[PDB]
């Protein structure tokens, strides 16, 4: 039926030099004496302080070059590990489909879109003086460098679903399913069937919607035939999905999406690695200072906004269509 | 030492 995969080792992207870049502080605003014109009509004046300003701005150009190199390496790694959701149809044929080991620093981390990754380099000045007033053009340039270069521009972020354990999206009826489909295709493209599996609860499941999980080899269990599909975790009842999952849930990771806002959401947990996905109708208004794990996400036209007391967290969303993910799963089903 | 410099220092 299926073909065979051989787990060749992952290629290595050019890693980010995660260090501590230090900038020397600006000079100390030296008091120029007014030139005392009797020694000015004859031809520490302004020339020495201007030459020292030019020296500091040369040094600031050098450290701006270094910071831009760090940001280029970071965006190169993030574009190697999270491609735009059209490239990953060409992935599952070549030697880079089941590539993300749990030892690599990207594992069970999913692309939601492109926004401002905060530049994991340090950018720490060694300002040690006790509020000595700085030079008004050197310190202005350093303050202009530490605020627009410390945030990388629109770069592929990560919805790390190894440490959230509940992805309860809210929003529209099918526009939330776009983002769910997008990062669930991102999940099933990069990681092995034996390293994670995927499960579904849905009322109208085999109807041109979520039926594209028909071909996913991650919906399997070991040693059960069930006619055509191996296990077919996609069902219509969440409790029947749980008893379908009860030997599988007691580490092979899991990703359980639910389509019903009602019909006992989160009746599986509350587990110890199983992370569930849910779509709810409407928001909580006064959630009690929400945890770093289990967040709230509302899908706008192109924004995936988080809940923090609106902290949009994605500037442009990644929205996969239905037949696109159908083609991803159809190319994926050949290999195992 | 100019008096202008110590005046700026006083200020």
UniProtKB/Swiss-Prot annotation, chain A:
Where is the protein found, in the record's own terms?
A: Cell inner membrane
- GO CC annotations, alphabetized: plasma membrane
Record note on disruption phenotype: Deletion of the gene impairs iron-bound mycobactin utilization and EsxG and EsxH export.
Does this entry carry the keyword rRNA-binding? no
What UniProt keywords are attached to this protein's entry? ATP-binding, Cell inner membrane, Cell membrane, Membrane, Nucleotide-binding, Repeat, Transmembrane, Transmembrane helix, Transport
- Quote one Gene Ontology molecular function term: ATP hydrolysis activity
Q: Which residues form the signal peptide?
A: none
Q: How does the record describe its quaternary structure?
A: Part of the ESX-3 / type VII secretion system (T7SS), which is composed of cytosolic and membrane components. The ESX-3 membrane complex is composed of EccB3, EccC3, EccD3 and EccE3.
Described function = Part of the ESX-3 specialized secretion system, which is required for siderophore-mediated iron acquisition and for the secretion of EsxH and EsxG.
**Descriptive protein name:** ESX-3 secretion system protein EccC3
Gene name linked to the record: eccC3
